[PDB]
Amino acid sequence: MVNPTVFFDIAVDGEPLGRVSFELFADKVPKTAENFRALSTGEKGFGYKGSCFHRIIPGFMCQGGDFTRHNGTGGKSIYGEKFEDENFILKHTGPGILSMANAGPNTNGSQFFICTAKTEWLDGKHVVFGKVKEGMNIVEAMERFGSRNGKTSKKITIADCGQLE
Numbered sequence: 001m002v003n004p005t006v007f008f009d010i011a012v013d014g015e016p017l018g019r020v021s022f023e024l025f026a027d028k029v030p031k032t033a034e035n036f037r038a039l040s041t042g043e044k045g046f047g048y049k050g051s052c053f054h055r056i057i058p059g060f061m062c063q064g065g066d067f068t069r070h071n072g073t074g075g076k077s078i079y080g081e082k083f084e085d086e087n088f089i090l091k092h093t094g095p096g097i098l099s100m101a102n103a104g105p106n107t108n109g110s111q112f113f114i115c116t117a118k119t120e121w122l123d124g125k126h127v128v129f130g131k132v133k134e135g136m137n138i139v140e141a142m143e144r145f146g147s148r149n150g151k152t153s154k155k156i157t158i159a160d161c162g163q164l165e
């Protein structure tokens with residue numbers, strides 16, 4: 001009944017930075033929320049632990065989730081390599097929105113982004129499925145290691161992750 005909560009513990013060149021937690025909107029996008037939850041616990045035998053944020057653009061977003069190729073060309077879902085766009089009920093309203101990255105219609109895998117600005121031009125094209133609950137300050141600290149072209153100045157990793165409650 002209650003929407004699940006997951007955490008990431010973030011590191012910067014291997015040094016601990018802080019924790020970011022997320023509410024997942026399982027009430028509105030159950031299939032998409034479940035994929036992110038299971039990848040965060042690692043319960044299917046694969047997932048986010050140890051992976052990096054490969055593309056960070058200040059004033060736009062932080063992107064990660066490519067645990068197979070580490071550069072934006074890989075990742076896989078708990079349902080197979082790809083799965084469909086579930087719905088577009090929720091919109092990209094401002095900083096803290098959690099949404100699926102993709103390469104065209106019906107190509108969701110594991111890659112995701114955290115908005116650091118309103119990104120309304122993505123509405124109806126990327127599936128919104130959660131939001132930052134605690135640690136937006138940690139996301140803002142991460143964002144400072146990005147650049148205009150998205151290349152990071154230090155390595156930003158998910159040192160640990162899992163489900164709270």
Ligand SMILES: CCOC(=O)CNC(=O)N(Cc1ccc(N)cc1)Cc1nnn[nH]1
Binds near residue numbers: 071073100101102107
């Ligand atoms: C704001 C979100 O924008 C997008 O999602 C656009 N595509 C995108 O960023 N991709 C391609 C991509 C994504 C998901 C999957 N599953 C496969 C490929 C990765 C990438 N990383 N660096 N350059 N491109």
